[PDB]
Short mmCIF file of N, CA and C in Angstrom, two decimals:
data_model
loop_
_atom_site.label_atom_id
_atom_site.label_comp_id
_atom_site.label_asym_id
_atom_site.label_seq_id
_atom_site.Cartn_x
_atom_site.Cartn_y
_atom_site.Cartn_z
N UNK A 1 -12.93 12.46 6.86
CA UNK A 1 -12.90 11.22 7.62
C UNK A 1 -12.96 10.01 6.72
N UNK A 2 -14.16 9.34 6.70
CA UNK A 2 -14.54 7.96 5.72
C UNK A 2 -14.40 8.57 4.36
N UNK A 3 -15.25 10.05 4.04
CA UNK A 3 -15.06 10.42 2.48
C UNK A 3 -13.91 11.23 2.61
N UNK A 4 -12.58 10.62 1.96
CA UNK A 4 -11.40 11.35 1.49
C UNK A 4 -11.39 12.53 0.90
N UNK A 5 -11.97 12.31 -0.30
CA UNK A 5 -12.22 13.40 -1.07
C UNK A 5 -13.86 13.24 -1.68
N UNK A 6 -14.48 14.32 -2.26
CA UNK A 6 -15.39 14.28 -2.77
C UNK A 6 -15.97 15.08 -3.86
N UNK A 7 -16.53 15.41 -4.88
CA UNK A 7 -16.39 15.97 -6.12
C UNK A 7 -17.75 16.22 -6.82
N UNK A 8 -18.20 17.59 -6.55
CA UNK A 8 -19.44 17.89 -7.09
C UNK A 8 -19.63 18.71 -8.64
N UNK A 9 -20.01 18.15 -9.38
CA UNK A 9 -20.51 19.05 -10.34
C UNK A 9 -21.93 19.06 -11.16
N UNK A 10 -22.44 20.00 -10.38
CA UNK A 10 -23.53 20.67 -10.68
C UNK A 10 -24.15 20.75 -12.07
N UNK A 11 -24.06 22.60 -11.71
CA UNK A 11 -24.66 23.32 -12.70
C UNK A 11 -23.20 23.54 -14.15
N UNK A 12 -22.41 24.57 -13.35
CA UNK A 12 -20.90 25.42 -13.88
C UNK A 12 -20.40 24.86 -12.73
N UNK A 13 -21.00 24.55 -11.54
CA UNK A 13 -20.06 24.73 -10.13
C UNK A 13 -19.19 23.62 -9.62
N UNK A 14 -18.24 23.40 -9.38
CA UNK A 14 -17.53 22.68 -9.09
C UNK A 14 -17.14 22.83 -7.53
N UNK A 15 -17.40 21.65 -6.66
CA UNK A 15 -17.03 21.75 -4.83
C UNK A 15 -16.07 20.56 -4.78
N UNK A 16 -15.02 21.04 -4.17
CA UNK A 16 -13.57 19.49 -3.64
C UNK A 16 -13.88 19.96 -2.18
N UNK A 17 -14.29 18.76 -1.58
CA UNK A 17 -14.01 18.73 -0.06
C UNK A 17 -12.81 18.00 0.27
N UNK A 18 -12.15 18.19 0.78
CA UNK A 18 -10.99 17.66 1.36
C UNK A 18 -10.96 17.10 3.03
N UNK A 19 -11.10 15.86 2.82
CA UNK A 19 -11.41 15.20 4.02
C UNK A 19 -9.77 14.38 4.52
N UNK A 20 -8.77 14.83 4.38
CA UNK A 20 -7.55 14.30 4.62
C UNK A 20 -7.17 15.00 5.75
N UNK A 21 -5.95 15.00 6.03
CA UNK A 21 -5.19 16.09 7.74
C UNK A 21 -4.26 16.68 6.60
N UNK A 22 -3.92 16.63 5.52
CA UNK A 22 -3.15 17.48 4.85
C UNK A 22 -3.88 18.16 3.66
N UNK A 23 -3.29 19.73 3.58
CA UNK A 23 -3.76 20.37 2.43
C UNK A 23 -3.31 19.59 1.03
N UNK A 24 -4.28 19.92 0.38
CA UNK A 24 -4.07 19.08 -1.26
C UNK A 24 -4.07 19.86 -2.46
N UNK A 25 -3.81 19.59 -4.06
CA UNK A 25 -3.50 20.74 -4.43
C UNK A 25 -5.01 19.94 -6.34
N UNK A 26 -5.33 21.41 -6.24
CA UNK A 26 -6.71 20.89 -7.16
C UNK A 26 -6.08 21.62 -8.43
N UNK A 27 -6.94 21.10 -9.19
CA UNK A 27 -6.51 21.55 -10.80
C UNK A 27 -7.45 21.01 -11.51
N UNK A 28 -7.90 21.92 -11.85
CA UNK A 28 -9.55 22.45 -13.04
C UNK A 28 -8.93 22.33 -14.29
N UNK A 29 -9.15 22.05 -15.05
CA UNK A 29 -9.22 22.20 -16.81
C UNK A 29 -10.64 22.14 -17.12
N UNK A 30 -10.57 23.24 -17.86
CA UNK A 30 -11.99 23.53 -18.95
C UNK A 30 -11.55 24.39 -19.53
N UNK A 31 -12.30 24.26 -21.10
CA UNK A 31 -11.99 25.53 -22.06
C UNK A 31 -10.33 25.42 -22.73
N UNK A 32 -9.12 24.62 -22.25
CA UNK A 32 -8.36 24.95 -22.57
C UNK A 32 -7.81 25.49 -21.77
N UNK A 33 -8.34 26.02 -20.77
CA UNK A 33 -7.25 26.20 -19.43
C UNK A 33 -7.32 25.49 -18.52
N UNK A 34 -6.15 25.84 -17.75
CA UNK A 34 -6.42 25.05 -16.49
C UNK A 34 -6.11 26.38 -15.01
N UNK A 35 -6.74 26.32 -14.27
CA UNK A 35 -7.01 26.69 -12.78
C UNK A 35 -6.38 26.01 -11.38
N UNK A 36 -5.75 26.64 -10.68
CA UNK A 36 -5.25 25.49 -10.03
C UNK A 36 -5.64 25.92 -8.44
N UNK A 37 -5.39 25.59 -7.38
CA UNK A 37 -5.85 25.82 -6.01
C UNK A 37 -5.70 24.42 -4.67
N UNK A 38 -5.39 25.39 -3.86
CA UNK A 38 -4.91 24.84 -3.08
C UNK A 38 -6.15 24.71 -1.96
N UNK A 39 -6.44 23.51 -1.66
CA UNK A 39 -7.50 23.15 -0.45
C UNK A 39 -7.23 22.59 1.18
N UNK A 40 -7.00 22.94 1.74
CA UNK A 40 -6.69 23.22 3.10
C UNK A 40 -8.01 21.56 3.77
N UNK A 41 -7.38 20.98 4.98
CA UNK A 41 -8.07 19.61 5.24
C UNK A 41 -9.36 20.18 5.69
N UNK A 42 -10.80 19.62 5.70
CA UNK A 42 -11.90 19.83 6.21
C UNK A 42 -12.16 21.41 5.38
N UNK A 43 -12.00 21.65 5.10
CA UNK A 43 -12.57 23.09 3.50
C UNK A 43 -13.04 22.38 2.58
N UNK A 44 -14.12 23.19 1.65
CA UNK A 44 -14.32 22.61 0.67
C UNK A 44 -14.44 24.01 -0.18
N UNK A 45 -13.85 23.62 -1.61
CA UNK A 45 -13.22 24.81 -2.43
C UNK A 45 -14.93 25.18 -3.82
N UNK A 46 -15.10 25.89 -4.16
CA UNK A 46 -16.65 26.37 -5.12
C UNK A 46 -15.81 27.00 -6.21
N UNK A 47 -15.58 26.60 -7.28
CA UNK A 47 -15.62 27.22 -8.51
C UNK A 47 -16.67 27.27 -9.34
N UNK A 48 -16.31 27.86 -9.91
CA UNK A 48 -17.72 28.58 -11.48
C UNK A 48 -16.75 27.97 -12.71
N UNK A 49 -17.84 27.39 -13.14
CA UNK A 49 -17.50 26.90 -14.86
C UNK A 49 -17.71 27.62 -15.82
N UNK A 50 -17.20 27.75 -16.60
CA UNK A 50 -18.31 29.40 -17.84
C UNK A 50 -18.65 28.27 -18.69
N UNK A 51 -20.32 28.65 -19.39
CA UNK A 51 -20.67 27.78 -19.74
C UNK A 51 -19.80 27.61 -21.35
N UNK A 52 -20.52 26.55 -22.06
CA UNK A 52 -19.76 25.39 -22.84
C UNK A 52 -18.58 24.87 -22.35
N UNK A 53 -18.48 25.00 -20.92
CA UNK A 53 -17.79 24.19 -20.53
C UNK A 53 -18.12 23.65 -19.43
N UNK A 54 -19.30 23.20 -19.35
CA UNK A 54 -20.24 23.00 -18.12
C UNK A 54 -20.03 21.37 -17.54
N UNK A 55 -19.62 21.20 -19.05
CA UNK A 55 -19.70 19.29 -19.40
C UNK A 55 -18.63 18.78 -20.26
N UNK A 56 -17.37 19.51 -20.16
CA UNK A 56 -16.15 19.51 -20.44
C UNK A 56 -14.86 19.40 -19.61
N UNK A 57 -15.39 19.24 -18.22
CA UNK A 57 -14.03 19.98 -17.39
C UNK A 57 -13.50 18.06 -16.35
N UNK A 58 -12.12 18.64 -16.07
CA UNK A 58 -11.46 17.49 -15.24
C UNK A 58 -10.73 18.59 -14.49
N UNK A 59 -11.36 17.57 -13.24
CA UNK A 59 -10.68 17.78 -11.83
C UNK A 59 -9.90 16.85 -11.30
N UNK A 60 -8.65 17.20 -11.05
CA UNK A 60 -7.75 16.75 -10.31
C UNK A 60 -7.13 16.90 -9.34
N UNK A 61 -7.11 15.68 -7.87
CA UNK A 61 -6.70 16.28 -7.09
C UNK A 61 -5.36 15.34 -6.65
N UNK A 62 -4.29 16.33 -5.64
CA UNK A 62 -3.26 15.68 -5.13
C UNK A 62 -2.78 15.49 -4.13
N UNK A 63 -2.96 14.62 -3.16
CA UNK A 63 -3.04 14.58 -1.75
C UNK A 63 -1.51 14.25 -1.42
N UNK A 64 -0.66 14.56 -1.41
CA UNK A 64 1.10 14.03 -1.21
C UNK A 64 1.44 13.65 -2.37
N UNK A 65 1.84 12.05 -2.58
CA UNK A 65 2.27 11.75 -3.55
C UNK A 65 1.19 10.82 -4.34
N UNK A 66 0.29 11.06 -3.80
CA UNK A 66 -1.05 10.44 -4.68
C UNK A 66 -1.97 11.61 -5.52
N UNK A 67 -2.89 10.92 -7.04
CA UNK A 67 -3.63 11.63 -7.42
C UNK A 67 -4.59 10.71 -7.72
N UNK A 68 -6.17 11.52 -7.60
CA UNK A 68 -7.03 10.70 -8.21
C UNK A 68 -7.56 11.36 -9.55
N UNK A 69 -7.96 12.36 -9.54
CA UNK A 69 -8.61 13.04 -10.81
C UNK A 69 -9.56 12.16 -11.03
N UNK A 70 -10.73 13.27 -11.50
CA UNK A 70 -12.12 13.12 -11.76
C UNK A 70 -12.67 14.05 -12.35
N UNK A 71 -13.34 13.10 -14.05
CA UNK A 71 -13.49 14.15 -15.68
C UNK A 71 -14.63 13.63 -15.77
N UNK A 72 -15.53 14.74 -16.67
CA UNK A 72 -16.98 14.67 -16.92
C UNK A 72 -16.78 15.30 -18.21
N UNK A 73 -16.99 14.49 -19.48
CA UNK A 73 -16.56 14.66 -20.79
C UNK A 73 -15.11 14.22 -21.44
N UNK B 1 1.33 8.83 -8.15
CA UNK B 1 0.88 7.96 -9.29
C UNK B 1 -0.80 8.70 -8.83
N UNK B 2 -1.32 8.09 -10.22
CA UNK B 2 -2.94 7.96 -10.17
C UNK B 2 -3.43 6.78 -9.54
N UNK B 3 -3.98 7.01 -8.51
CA UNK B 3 -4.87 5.98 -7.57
C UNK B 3 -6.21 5.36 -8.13
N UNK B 4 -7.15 6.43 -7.91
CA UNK B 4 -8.55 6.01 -8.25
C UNK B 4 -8.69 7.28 -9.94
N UNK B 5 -9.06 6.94 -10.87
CA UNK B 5 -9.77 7.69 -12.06
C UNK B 5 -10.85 7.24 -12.46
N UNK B 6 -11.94 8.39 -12.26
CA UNK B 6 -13.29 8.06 -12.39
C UNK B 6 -13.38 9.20 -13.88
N UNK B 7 -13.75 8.83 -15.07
CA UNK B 7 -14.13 9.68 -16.22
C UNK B 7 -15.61 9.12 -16.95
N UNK B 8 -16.29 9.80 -16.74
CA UNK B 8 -18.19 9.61 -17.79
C UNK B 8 -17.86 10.65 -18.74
N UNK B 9 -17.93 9.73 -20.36
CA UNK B 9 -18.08 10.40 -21.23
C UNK B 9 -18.80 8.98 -21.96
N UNK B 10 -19.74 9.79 -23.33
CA UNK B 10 -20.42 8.59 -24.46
C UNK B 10 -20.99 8.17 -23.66
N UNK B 11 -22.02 8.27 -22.52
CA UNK B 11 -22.50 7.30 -22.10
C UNK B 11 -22.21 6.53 -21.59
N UNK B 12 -20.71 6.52 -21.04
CA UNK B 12 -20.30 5.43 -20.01
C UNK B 12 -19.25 5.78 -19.23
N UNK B 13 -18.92 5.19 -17.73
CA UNK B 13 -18.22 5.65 -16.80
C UNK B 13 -17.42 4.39 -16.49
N UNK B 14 -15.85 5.23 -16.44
CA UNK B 14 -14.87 3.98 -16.86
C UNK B 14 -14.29 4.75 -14.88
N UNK B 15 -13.87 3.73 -14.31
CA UNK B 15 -13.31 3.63 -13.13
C UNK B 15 -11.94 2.73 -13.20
N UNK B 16 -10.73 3.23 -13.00
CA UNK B 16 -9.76 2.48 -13.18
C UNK B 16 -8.92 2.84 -11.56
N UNK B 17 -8.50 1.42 -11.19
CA UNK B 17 -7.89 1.22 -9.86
C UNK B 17 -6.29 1.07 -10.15
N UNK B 18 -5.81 2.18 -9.47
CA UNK B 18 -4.82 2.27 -9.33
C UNK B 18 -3.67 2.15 -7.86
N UNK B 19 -4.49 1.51 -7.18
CA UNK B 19 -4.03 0.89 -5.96
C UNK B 19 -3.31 -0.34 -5.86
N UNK B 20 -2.80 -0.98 -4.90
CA UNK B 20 -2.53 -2.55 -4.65
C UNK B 20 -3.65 -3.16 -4.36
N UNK B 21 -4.54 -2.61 -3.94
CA UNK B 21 -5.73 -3.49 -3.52
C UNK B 21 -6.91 -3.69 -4.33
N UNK B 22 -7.83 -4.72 -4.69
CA UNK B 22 -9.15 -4.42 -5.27
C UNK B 22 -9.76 -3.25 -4.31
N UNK B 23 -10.58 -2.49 -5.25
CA UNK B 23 -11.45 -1.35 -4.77
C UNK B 23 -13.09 -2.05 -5.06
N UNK B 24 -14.21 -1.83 -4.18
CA UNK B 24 -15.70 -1.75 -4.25
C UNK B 24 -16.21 -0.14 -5.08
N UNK B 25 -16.79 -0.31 -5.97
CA UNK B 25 -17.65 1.07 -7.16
C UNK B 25 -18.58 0.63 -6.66
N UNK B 26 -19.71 2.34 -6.35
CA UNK B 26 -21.15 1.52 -6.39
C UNK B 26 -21.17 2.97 -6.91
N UNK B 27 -21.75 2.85 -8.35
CA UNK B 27 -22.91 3.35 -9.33
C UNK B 27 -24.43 3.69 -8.72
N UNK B 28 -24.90 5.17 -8.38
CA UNK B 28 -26.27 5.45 -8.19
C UNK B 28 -26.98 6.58 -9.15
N UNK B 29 -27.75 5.77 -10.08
CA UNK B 29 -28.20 6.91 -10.87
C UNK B 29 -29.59 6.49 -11.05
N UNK B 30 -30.94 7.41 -11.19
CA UNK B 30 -32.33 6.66 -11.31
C UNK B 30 -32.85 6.06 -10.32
N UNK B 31 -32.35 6.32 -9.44
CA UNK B 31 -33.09 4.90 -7.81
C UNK B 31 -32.15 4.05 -7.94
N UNK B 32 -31.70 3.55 -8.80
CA UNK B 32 -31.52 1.92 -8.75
C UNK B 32 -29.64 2.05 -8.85
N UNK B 33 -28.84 1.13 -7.81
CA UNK B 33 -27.69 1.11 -7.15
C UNK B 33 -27.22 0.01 -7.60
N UNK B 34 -26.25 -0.05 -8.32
CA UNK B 34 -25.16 -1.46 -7.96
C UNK B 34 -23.96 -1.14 -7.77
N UNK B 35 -23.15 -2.75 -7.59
CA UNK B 35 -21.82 -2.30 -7.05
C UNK B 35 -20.81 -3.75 -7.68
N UNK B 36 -19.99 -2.96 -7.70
CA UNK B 36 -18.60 -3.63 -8.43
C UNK B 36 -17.64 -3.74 -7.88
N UNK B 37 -17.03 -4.50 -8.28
CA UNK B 37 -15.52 -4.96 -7.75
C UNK B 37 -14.14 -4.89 -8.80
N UNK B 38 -14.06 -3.69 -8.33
CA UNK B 38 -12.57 -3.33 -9.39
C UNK B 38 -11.09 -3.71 -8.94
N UNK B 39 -10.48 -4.73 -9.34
CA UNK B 39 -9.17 -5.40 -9.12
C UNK B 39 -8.11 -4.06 -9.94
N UNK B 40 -7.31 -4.60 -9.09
CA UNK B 40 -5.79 -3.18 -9.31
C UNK B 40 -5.22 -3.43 -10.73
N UNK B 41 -4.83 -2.08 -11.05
CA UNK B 41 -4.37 -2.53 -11.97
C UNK B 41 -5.60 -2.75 -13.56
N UNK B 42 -6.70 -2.58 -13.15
CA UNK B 42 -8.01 -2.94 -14.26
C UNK B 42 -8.96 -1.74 -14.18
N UNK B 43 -9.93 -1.58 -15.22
CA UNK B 43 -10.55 -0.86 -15.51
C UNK B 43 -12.13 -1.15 -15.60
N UNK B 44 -12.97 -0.64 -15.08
CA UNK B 44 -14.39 -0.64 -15.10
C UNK B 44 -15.26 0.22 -15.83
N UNK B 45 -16.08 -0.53 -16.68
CA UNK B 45 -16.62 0.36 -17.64
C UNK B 45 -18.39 -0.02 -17.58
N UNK B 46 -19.05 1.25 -16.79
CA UNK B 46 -20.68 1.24 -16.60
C UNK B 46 -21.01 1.76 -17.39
N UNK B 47 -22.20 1.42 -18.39
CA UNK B 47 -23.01 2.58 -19.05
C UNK B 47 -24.01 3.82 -17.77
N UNK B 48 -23.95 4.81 -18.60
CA UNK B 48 -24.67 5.78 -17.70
C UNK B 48 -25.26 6.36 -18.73
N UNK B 49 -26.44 6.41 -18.62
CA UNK B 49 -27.07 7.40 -19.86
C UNK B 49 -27.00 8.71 -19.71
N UNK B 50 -26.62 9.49 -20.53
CA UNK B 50 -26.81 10.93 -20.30
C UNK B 50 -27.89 11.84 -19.76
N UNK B 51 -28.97 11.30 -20.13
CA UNK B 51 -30.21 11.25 -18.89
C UNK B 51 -29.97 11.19 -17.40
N UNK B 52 -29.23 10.27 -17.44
CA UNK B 52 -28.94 9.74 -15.99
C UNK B 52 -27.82 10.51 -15.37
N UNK B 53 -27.36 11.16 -16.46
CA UNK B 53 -25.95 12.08 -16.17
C UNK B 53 -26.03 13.31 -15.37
N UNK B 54 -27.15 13.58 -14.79
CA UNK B 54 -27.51 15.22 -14.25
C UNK B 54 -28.09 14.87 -12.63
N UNK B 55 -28.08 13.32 -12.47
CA UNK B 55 -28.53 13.05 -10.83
C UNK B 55 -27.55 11.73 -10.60
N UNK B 56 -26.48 11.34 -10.99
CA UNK B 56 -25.83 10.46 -11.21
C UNK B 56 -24.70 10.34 -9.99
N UNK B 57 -24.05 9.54 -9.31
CA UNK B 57 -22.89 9.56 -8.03
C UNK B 57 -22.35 8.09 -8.44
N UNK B 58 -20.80 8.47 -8.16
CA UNK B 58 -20.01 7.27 -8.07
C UNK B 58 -18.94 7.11 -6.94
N UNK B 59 -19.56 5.92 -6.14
CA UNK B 59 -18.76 6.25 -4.96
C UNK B 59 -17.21 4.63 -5.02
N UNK B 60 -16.32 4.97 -4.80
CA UNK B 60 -15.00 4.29 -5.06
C UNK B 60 -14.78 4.25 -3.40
N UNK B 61 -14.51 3.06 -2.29
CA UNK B 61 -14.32 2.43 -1.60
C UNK B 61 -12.71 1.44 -1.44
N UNK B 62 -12.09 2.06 -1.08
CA UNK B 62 -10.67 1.49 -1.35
C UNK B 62 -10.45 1.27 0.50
N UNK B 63 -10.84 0.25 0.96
CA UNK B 63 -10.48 0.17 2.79
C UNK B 63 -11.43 0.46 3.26
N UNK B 64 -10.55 1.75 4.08
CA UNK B 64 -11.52 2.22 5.00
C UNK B 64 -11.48 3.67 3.98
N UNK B 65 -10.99 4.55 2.73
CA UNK B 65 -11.01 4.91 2.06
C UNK B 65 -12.40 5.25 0.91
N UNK B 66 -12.83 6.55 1.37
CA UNK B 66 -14.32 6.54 0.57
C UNK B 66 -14.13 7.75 -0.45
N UNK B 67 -14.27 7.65 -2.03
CA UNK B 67 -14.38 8.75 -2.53
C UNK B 67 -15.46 8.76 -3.17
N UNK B 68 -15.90 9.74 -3.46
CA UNK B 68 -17.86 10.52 -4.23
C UNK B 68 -17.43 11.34 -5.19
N UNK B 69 -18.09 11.08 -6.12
CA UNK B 69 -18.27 12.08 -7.60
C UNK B 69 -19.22 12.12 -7.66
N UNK B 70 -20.05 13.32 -7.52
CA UNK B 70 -21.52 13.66 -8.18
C UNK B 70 -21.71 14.40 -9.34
N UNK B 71 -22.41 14.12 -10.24
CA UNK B 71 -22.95 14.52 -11.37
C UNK B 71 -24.20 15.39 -10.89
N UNK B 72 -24.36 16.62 -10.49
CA UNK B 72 -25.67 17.12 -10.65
C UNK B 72 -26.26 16.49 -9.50
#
């Protein structure tokens, strides 16, 4: 609704809620890779970080033709 | 395009608006809250101590448009 998107990182754990009417498309980097996933509107997606990369990683998300991305390190 | 980019690294959290519109930042880390006014097109740069980095939220306000980053 009011929060579009929202972006938790924890511990390792990473949560994207997706507060839009359209699915959006997420993308993790840490370590040198990247992870990618698809979040469906009103879901919110839980990944695991392995550590030393706890405080290394960027999340990006893509709602149509918009992105915001959001990095911690 | 990139809209809103929120990145904390070194101790400081840079918010850059990538909208047509100025965006409202409000910074909550320690109890204590403020808030900014980021014009399009420009970049915002808060210190955050790394201390502060493990209970820390940055919330970006674009309209009626609300986004949250939590740190811990």
């Amino acid at each position: 609704g009011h929060m579009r998107i929202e972006v938790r990182v924890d511990n390792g754990r990473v949560r994207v809620r997706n507060g839009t009417d359209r699915p959006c498309r997420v993308r993790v980097t840490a370590g040198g890779e990247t992870r990618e996933y698809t979040v469906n509107p009103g879901t919110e997606l839980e990944v695991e970080l392995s550590p030393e990369q706890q405080n290394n990683a960027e999340v990006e998300v893509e709602c149509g033709n918009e992105k915001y991305r959001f990095q911690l390190g």
